[PDB]
Design a protein around this nucleic acid. Sequence first.
DNA 1: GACGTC
DNA 2: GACGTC
Length: 8
Amino acid sequence: XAXVXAXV
DNA sequence: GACGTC
DNA sequence: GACGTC
Ligand SMILES: *C(=O)c1cnc2ccccc2n1
Ligand SMILES: *C(=O)c1cnc2ccccc2n1
């Protein structure tokens, strides 16, 4: 759920 | 070494 | 249970 390297 | 929701 | 880039 967080976006810092993938964003899901 | 750093972040959590569809 | 899914997703890695600075
Ligand atoms: C987002 O909340 C989140 C949390 N845990 C994860 C584990 C694996 C892939 C993606 C994820 N996303
Ligand atoms: C992104 O590629 C990525 C990879 N590992 C992580 C570990 C902990 C927090 C965030 C992260 N992001």
